Amino acid sequence: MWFGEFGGQYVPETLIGPLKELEKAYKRFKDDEEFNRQLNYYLKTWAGRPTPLYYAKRLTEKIGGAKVYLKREDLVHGGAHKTNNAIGQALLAKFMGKTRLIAETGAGQHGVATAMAGALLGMKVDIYMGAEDVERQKMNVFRMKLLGANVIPVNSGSRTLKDAINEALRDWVATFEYTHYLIGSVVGPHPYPTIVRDFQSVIGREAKAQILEAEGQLPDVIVACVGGGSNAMGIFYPFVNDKKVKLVGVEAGGKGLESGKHSASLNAGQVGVSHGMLSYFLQDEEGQIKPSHSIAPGLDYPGVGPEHAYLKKIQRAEYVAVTDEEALKAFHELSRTEGIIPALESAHAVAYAMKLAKEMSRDEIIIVNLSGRGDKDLDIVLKVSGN
């Protein structure tokens, strides 16, 4: 349950049993033949795995430095890497005999992934969402309802993701016997940070095989955006024991790191406890988590995974930040240059990789995790960038 000093299970006693039962079922099923057969089957036929690894030749040559490859999680069913975890946990829940899934969501993206996986496996889905987020994500809320999920607006507290998490936790205490709490990033009490990372590591395993086929060697740098940290852990984890492979996580710089309007928890946060985990959080004088900002809706998780805090501490991975403006420019640039519209979240990784590529030599290789597609962000970009 610990990654160095980060992680743990900081929850009330009523949740210890349910977390124990989940940990027990996961230890059994994670290496179970039938479970992995079905999981790999759903991932192949329904999700469309494997996703390709694409060499961005025009972008590479335009920048004039290192080769830039894109791991195309944007092509997974639903348009984002979140599906990998949603299927894994939903199937796990079915194997544990649960009939219902609950989840929280801020951007709505995890809510959608959860609703998709629940519909697939024939399970009831309830999604807790802060009323302020509900208001701003009307199409995601509609998507969830199309998928047969029930969206429950959370009106308490600040009507945001933090408040939804608290409601979801309260629901699970009472309903855990038939309900699985499907956490959407590498966060929360153990064993969630481990489970989510395990279910996303397929990205890194495919990427490793794909890059070896393409270039006959491991990459020099892997770059991924970091909200809660799941897409980054997914692509990082199989390369952790490859000492030569540099790992860079990109947080939301928002309006700027000194502006006080960003979501760079590792970069500017402090150690604290929330959502059952000891990790880095941006918190106020009174210890309360403060509002995070980013143009990218999905980089709004309040905090960061304990495994990322650990990788930072031991200096296995480096963490940087990219601003809203920089992310936007990358969003336009990739669309024009390679014909791929990325998610605004993923654009942060693209933005940094472009800066990094310029510094590196042409024989060198950068893999960017393109965690999602940008169809969902077109309304946003039109408003901000203009017609």
Place this chain on the structure above:
Amino acid sequence: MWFGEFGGQYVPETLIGPLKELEKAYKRFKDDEEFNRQLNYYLKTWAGRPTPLYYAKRLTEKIGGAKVYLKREDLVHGGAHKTNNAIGQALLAKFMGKTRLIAETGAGQHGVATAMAGALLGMKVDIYMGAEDVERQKMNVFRMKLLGANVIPVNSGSRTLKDAINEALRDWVATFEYTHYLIGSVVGPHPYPTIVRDFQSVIGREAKAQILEAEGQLPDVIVACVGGGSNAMGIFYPFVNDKKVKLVGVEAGGKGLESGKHSASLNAGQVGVSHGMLSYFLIKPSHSIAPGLDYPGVGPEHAYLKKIQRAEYVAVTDEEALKAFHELSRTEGIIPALESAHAVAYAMKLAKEMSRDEIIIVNLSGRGDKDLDIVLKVSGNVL
């Protein structure tokens, strides 16, 4: 250059020279080792081919008849099958030494795919689009511009696809030396209907292999929606010589066949010569809830198929397609394109009658993200 009587090359001598060069290019490259290498590489790494063949277990069990499989073209880069054709023609153009692509569009869906493909290969892209359609498709227009293409609204006359076609053709006459005209369905003069069907036939080849792998036998029925007819021909074509395999093309019934607001060219059209080809045309205003099913014409090869009775052609209404849209989302967690929902709707009706040993493949031509605003507007109008 013909499919029975249908097809052909009915154009002025201004267009004959560039088409002839296109065939010499296509014949040279269609089977060329280098062209096929690069095409397959882009289809794999950029488009994400192959797409899986998915067994809709819950939907199959619910209906209680035939096994329903979905060929998941919704998973191709861009969320639609059109990408397969866009990459093929754009690559051909680069091989021919062209630096620019032009195309027409109504829904905007083919315009987006051309912009994507053109961006991929570093070509200038100009999309001609009718002004009435430009105003109806704000997000697709924005997409095209974001992808680096220029959208040329046609404000003269009818302001529809018909006018966009005319302007694009005029453009190609002047600029074919450095410009390739990229047609978006199995329509127009030779060699376009053949070329587009060729570039989409990968759908059927994957599907054939995938169904043999899954079930050890060919399917009893293949169902696909029909606008211009590219996704249906793509999946149909590799099974044409396998005689026990029924082929069904599903047209837009719209408000109703009796209502006169639909796009069912084969069911209610008349034979005519348009877009430089002999085929079925309605011209009249076509209507459908699914934007991509707007084309009043239909591919000549579907004309050829209907006359010899090799494929059957049917229609599904706006209301039925909407029902299937909701049904597939809730039952399989797959939100289909409204075009594709026409096929799903018909396949569901068809499954009920058939036995449990029997197999249906539905071509899920696209994803429904693009249609959510439309469906929200209608869904919010329910009582």
